[PDB]
Design an enzyme around this catalytic site. Structure first.
Site, mmCIF file in Angstrom:
data_model
loop_
_atom_site.group_PDB
_atom_site.id
_atom_site.type_symbol
_atom_site.label_atom_id
_atom_site.label_comp_id
_atom_site.label_asym_id
_atom_site.label_seq_id
_atom_site.Cartn_x
_atom_site.Cartn_y
_atom_site.Cartn_z
ATOM 1 N N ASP A 147 0.761 -0.949 -0.170
ATOM 2 C CA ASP A 147 0.328 0.189 -0.013
ATOM 3 C C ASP A 147 1.009 1.302 -0.022
ATOM 4 O OD1 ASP A 147 -2.115 1.819 0.583
ATOM 5 O OD2 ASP A 147 -3.118 1.210 2.084
ATOM 6 N N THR A 148 1.443 1.516 -1.022
ATOM 7 C CA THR A 148 2.081 2.953 -0.995
ATOM 8 C C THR A 148 2.017 4.390 -0.858
ATOM 9 O OG1 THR A 148 1.265 3.373 -3.709
ATOM 10 C CG2 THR A 148 3.421 1.865 -3.104
ATOM 11 N N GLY A 149 0.454 4.477 -0.901
ATOM 12 C CA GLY A 149 -0.407 5.059 0.213
ATOM 13 C C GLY A 149 -0.621 4.931 1.238
HETATM 14 C C1 LIG Z 1 -13.029 1.547 -3.408
HETATM 15 O O1 LIG Z 1 -11.430 2.511 -4.442
HETATM 16 C C2 LIG Z 1 -11.332 2.759 -2.601
HETATM 17 C C3 LIG Z 1 -11.400 2.425 -1.163
HETATM 18 C C4 LIG Z 1 -10.768 3.110 -0.428
HETATM 19 C C5 LIG Z 1 -9.011 3.267 -0.027
HETATM 20 S S1 LIG Z 1 -8.387 4.244 0.765
HETATM 21 O O2 LIG Z 1 -8.156 5.222 0.767
HETATM 22 O O3 LIG Z 1 -9.154 4.035 2.128
HETATM 23 N N1 LIG Z 1 -7.170 3.156 1.240
HETATM 24 C C6 LIG Z 1 -7.374 1.354 1.469
HETATM 25 C C7 LIG Z 1 -7.036 1.258 2.327
HETATM 26 C C8 LIG Z 1 -7.459 1.394 3.521
HETATM 27 C C9 LIG Z 1 -6.665 -0.215 2.182
HETATM 28 C C10 LIG Z 1 -6.174 4.041 0.156
HETATM 29 C C11 LIG Z 1 -5.079 3.655 1.401
HETATM 30 O O4 LIG Z 1 -3.745 3.809 0.819
HETATM 31 C C12 LIG Z 1 -5.022 4.954 2.443
HETATM 32 C C13 LIG Z 1 -4.783 5.854 1.459
HETATM 33 C C14 LIG Z 1 -4.723 7.754 2.349
HETATM 34 C C15 LIG Z 1 -4.252 8.359 2.097
HETATM 35 C C16 LIG Z 1 -4.239 9.482 3.201
HETATM 36 C C17 LIG Z 1 -5.427 9.894 3.415
HETATM 37 C C18 LIG Z 1 -6.356 9.135 3.552
HETATM 38 C C19 LIG Z 1 -6.228 7.774 2.527
HETATM 39 N N2 LIG Z 1 -3.713 5.560 3.005
HETATM 40 C C20 LIG Z 1 -4.324 5.085 4.706
HETATM 41 O O5 LIG Z 1 -4.834 5.195 5.368
HETATM 42 C C21 LIG Z 1 -3.172 5.817 5.655
HETATM 43 C C22 LIG Z 1 -2.589 6.507 4.949
HETATM 44 C C23 LIG Z 1 -1.795 7.400 5.995
HETATM 45 C C24 LIG Z 1 -1.255 6.820 7.370
HETATM 46 C C25 LIG Z 1 -2.170 5.089 7.507
HETATM 47 O O6 LIG Z 1 -1.217 4.269 8.787
HETATM 48 C C26 LIG Z 1 -2.817 4.796 6.387
HETATM 49 C C27 LIG Z 1 -9.358 4.341 -1.521
HETATM 50 C C28 LIG Z 1 -9.748 3.864 -2.374
#
Ligand SMILES: COc1ccc(S(=O)(=O)N(CC(C)C)C[C@@H](O)[C@H](Cc2ccccc2)NC(=O)c2cccc(O)c2)cc1
Lengths: 99, 99
Positions: free
Chosen positions: B25-27
């Site tokens: 998870d690069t995000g």
């Molecule tokens: C169906 O499409 C999607 C469903 C869910 C997501 S998601 O964003 O929940 N999400 C899905 C996963 C949780 C499975 C993508 C993540 O990469 C998310 C991106 C991120 C970054 C900063 C602030 C909010 C979100 N990161 C994070 O949740 C994150 C960010 C920073 C620190 C940390 O500990 C976690 C994205 C797309």
């Protein structure tokens, strides 16, 4: 290019006359953009992650330029704290993970 | 390996003799695992995602073998929707994005 992950993988994207910074996010199935009043048809959707769900608007076949690479597809618009380029568009620009 | 993104980049991890599936998870800044037991001291912490903030338990200096590659670092345990390997460990295993 090659992007290391010491910092957040933010790149410049374009949607229309908006340039935004967005995360190249392998953990995201779908592309999620901060609130913007895009033209065209949409459908409501809920998406979930850490902390729960947000409500988004799903717009289809939206052209998006990502680091100068052309993409076109579904984008979800809503109150995300960060612009997220998900796998649906990462594949279109030829993005892989490598280690 | 080189991992394309037409499917979720799920990989097997080894943590405490246990095999689990986790999402590269690069995000994600942090590595966040679903509820599990880990030995040793931990600290309460809060993290924010797309849907808001959650409470997690922070374990430091934990070994994880991620798709055959060794990392030792911080692991957060809490109500994440799926096990995620974040940048803190992706960097350790030499993971980059390429397009
Ligand atoms: C169906 O499409 C999607 C469903 C869910 C997501 S998601 O964003 O929940 N999400 C899905 C996963 C949780 C499975 C993508 C993540 O990469 C998310 C991106 C991120 C970054 C900063 C602030 C909010 C979100 N990161 C994070 O949740 C994150 C960010 C920073 C620190 C940390 O500990 C976690 C994205 C797309």
């Amino acid at each position: 290019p090659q992007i290391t992950l010491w910092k957040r993988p933010l790149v410049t994207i374009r949607i229309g006359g908006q340039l935004k910074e967005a995360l190249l996010d392998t953990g995201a199935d779908d592309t999620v953009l901060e609130e913007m009043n895009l033209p065209g048809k949409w459908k409501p959707k809920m998406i979930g992650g850490i902390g729960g769900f947000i409500k988004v608007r799903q717009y289809d076949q939206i052209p998006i330029e990502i680091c100068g690479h052309k993409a076109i597809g579904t984008v979800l618009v809503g109150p995300t704290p960060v612009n997220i380029i998900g796998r649906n568009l990462l594949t279109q620009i030829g993005c892989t993970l490598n280690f």
